[PDB]
Amino acid sequence: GPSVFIFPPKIKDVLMISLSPMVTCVVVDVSEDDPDVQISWFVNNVEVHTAQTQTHREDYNSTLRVVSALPIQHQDWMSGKEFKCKVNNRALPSPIEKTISKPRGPVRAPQVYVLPPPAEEMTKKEFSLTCMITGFLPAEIAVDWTSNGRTEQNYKNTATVLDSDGSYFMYSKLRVQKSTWERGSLFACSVVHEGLHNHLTTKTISR
Amino acid sequence: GPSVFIFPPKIKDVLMISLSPMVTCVVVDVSEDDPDVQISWFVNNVEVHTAQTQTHREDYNSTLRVVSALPIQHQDWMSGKEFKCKVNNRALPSPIEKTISKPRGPVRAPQVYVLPPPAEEMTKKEFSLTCMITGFLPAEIAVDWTSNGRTEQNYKNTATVLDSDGSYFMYSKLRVQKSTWERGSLFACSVVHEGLHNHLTTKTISRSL
Ligand SMILES: *[C@@H]1O[C@H](CO)[C@@H](O)[C@H](O)[C@H]1NC(C)=O
Ligand SMILES: *[C@@H]1O[C@H](CO)[C@@H](O)[C@H](O)[C@H]1NC(C)=O
Ligand code: NA
Ligand code: NA
Ligand code: NA
Ligand code: NA
Ligand code: NA
Ligand code: NA
């Protein structure tokens, strides 16, 4: 029978004013036999009408998937409003309702350090800069690297890890060519998180 | 109906001759209407009778789960022998078999580095040491720390992550007391991997003396 998953906005979309956060309801395992699904949306129990809906056939398994995305405003998310989708379909005994909201909770800024390559690695052609990001709450975060305003396309983030502290940590590893490092370039680890002034901090390292 | 999952040994158990590596067959969704499950085990097609087999009740769901763990020899795993469990039940249209072995593939030793802590952190009462582990293949690795030669408790590991050259990396973070660090205590990140000589390396750090 059909199931419904509700998704919050991406952290970066809600913490940066130029972006476009979305709350999304996804209805999965809609039978070919009962294909018609009615989705309706609510913000603090007031019905709203701006959601964009798409329907995908999954012919291979005789099902369909319906995706409904509500475009939201950053302040409504940050102030705690409840976003609710109600899903109706003839194969359900009653409508399924899913709700989501920003959980109220403690907020700890991460400490962010950019660490140079180890001495033992300098003898190589390329090597690893480490962005260490510790002590943050809640777990939602975004971490990216740039150089001279160019997004580097060769870094890897670890998954976030719960520290024995109650807080979370992660690391991001940037691979850099020796030549780029020796010509004096600035590498910037930028971290987006609820704790940070203007929701953003950027730490830079070079030779 | 019932289904079967097979699991490999933990890498630390296999790489260390004092420990007891197991290969495990788990049978889920066994109906309490046909509760009896027979598991047999084979190592390159020869039947072995050393496994320990338990049944856990899941009465909330009128189901059972059967866990059969076969204690294996370290060299059978490492040399690529096939471990196989055959599962028989009354309600099964026919016996289910699962097989597992260690894939043959290239082996690249981990590069292990303990990163020196920033000065701002060392003035605090408690701070973090970071062990960075890169370029290893295969993914299976065990990482921990010692202080003065005794295995530490207060550390956390990241998951391994696939790097862009086809090797893996990870990081390990140990929490350290300033008072212990100032005492000149030795801190060591210990790494177990099949690519290392004697399957172990250590990298150490302490206060400047
Ligand atoms: C195929 O569809 C059924 C629903 O009719 C669902 O229960 C099952 O998970 C689907 N299979 C896969 C492999 O996604
Ligand atoms: C309850 O029993 C059925 C088998 O009859 C099983 O497939 C199902 O997964 C069980 N539900 C859970 C959550 O274990
Ligand atoms: Na909210
Ligand atoms: Na580094
Ligand atoms: Na540089
Ligand atoms: Na076999
Ligand atoms: Na094997
Ligand atoms: Na290994």
Numbering used by the authors:
A (entry chain B): 237 to 443
B (entry chain A): 237 to 445
Quoted passage from the original study:
FcγRs bind IgG through the invariant homodimeric crystallizable fragment (Fc) formed by the C-terminal halves of the gamma heavy chain. Mice strains express three IgG2 subclasses: IgG2a, 2b and 2c that share 74–80% primary sequence identity in the hinge and Fc regions with greatest similarity in the receptor binding Cγ2 domains. With this expression and NMR technique we investigated mouse antibody fragments and characterized differences in structure and function between mouse IgG2b and 2c Fc. Here we demonstrate that mouse IgG2b and 2c have similar Fc structures for the complex-type N-glycoforms, however mIgG2c Fc binds FcγRIV with greater affinity.
